[PDB]
Swiss-Prot record:
Organism, scientific name: Rattus norvegicus
Binding sites annotated in the UniProt record for a glycoprotein: S94, G131, S132, G133, N135
Membrane spanning residue stretches: none
Subcellular location: Nucleus; Chromosome
Modification note: May also be polyubiquitinated. Ubiquitination is mediated by the CUL3/SPOP E3 complex and does not promote proteasomal degradation. Instead, it is required for enrichment in inactive X chromosome chromatin.
Role, per record: Variant histone H2A which replaces conventional H2A in a subset of nucleosomes where it represses transcription. Nucleosomes wrap and compact DNA into chromatin, limiting DNA accessibility to the cellular machineries which require DNA as a template. Histones thereby play a central role in transcription regulation, DNA repair, DNA replication and chromosomal stability. DNA accessibility is regulated via a complex set of post-translational modifications of histones, also called histone code, and nucleosome remodeling. Involved in stable X chromosome inactivation.
Protein name: Core histone macro-H2A.1
Residues in cross-link Glycyl lysine isopeptide (Lys-Gly) (interchain with G-Cter in SUMO2): K139
Quaternary structure (record): The nucleosome is a histone octamer containing two molecules each of H2A, H2B, H3 and H4 assembled in one H3-H4 heterotetramer and two H2A-H2B heterodimers. Interacts with HDAC1 and HDAC2. Interacts with SPOP. Part of a complex consisting of MACROH2A1, CUL3 and SPOP.
Length: 188
């Protein structure tokens, strides 16, 4: 349904791909929803997911909020992808640019998301731009950290079931930034 703009195949077999589309429409096993400690769903990603999933999507998040309690910084939690093409929604609470250890916390956020996907043996995960924008990270800084974390995760987790990682972006600058950063991984 969509078109891949750039592909980076890591040495361990994972395919990282940049795509420009509605992240809520992507048929990936998991979709990442950047949120806050209270599972707020008004973000741009949250909005498109609620648009797609409607009541079902929202109920699932409301139930998760109840069971999980406040989502700590860099924490991630999963709700069933009811009402969405994605099988699961992985909610994450990224640190805010400027926090004491915001950079290492952004990397941790990403790793926590990937870990939750592997816990369910998922084969694909779609990430929107995290950290930058809402949470204040410069776009390039966020991109570098996220890719560094993903790269690090795969060379540290041998049993990983994740075969495809999508970066779903909307603006040209973000696309340009991600393709540049992605090209730096396993390029020897
Ligand atoms: Au920082």
């Amino acid at each position: 349904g969509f078109t891949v703009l750039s592909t980076k195949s890591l040495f361990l077999g994972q395919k990282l791909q940049v795509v420009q589309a509605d992240i809520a429409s992507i048929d990936s096993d998991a979709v990442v929803h950047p949120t806050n400690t209270d599972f707020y769903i008004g973000g741009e990603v949250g909005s498109t997911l609620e648009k797609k999933g409607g009541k079902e999507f929202v109920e699932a998040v409301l139930e998760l909020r109840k069971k999980n309690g406040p989502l700590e910084v860099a924490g991630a939690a999963v709700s069933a992808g009811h009402g969405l093409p994605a099988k699961f929604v992985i909610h994450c609470n990224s640190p805010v640019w400027g926090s004491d250890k915001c950079e290492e916390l952004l990397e941790k956020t990403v790793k926590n998301c990937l870990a939750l996907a592997d816990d369910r043996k998922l084969k694909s995960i779609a990430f929107p731009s995290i950290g930058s924008g809402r949470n204040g990270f410069p776009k390039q800084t966020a991109a570098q950290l996220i890719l560094k974390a993903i790269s690090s995760y795969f060379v540290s987790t041998m049993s990983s079931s994740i075969k495809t990682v999508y970066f779903v972006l909307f603006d040209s600058e973000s696309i340009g930034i991600y393709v540049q950063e992605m090209a730096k991984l396993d390029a020897n």
